[PDB]
Amino acid sequence: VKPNYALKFTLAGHTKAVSSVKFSPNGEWLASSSADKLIKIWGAYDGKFEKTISGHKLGISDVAWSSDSNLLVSASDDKTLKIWDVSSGKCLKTLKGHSNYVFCCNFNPQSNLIVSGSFDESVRIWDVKTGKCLKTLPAHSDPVSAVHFNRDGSLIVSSSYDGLCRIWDTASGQCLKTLIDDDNPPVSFVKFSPNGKYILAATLDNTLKLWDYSKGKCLKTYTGHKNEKYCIFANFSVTGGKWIVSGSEDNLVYIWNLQTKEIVQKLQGHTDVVISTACHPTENIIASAALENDKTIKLWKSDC
């Protein structure tokens, strides 16, 4: 069985490359961040522009939703994160502490903490309520490309241009695992699987890998796309068939069968590198976002 994602909507409004798209956990909204320093909110089902959230002084590399779909956190070249009340558009807190560009961010599932990664080679853990830094992890020896909490929030996974994925105890800050395969390409993305058993890691050698982190073993490789340059997001699609989804530097969205590793679909339409994809929590909907020559977000829907 293969999906049949078809283009439904093209979303225009960002004035520069879109960096990240994310669906609200409640399925109502899409959030986009851009090099234009703006966050935009869109209807998840019709792509209808909702509003613009402004305040960062430089470009934004990432945005993430709180568990209850009420807050966003954004990571900016201005070396801050900002916590946003989506309904009021207010910046609740500006998180200062990184010494270089903030590249990546996520809430824990309980959305009382934020984790951030930076060009300063550190991972920071922040208290959402106070907007104060709880912990600074000397995580990596090169920029941190991605950070993610596991299912219960007790672990963080980080990835870096230093070629390493690391697993951290949230509470203690201790490094519990270093993961690397038989080469040392920059790691451009990582996240835990929904069931919390696996990490999915992108490397800048055109490869995605599914790891059992507790066993420290590479279980599955996904190849056939182009990824040698940019920090491209990857996703688990779980609403229909069990897929892996990634953008690609050939301007396509790639979809793989998670179990068999075969390509099941390539989505054509963008005019530049697809930097970001996101999978809707309840419907077979993919959002995709592309770089400076395109500046659009696309919404794709499948029967399965």
Binding site: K16, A17, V18, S19, S20, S34, A35, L58, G59, I60, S61, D62, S76, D77, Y101, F103, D142, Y161, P186, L204, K229, Y230, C231, I275, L291, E292
Partner: peptide
């Protein structure tokens, strides 16, 4: 930002 950022 991510949109031009390389290794």
């Amino acid at each position: 930002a991510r949109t031009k950022e390389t290794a």
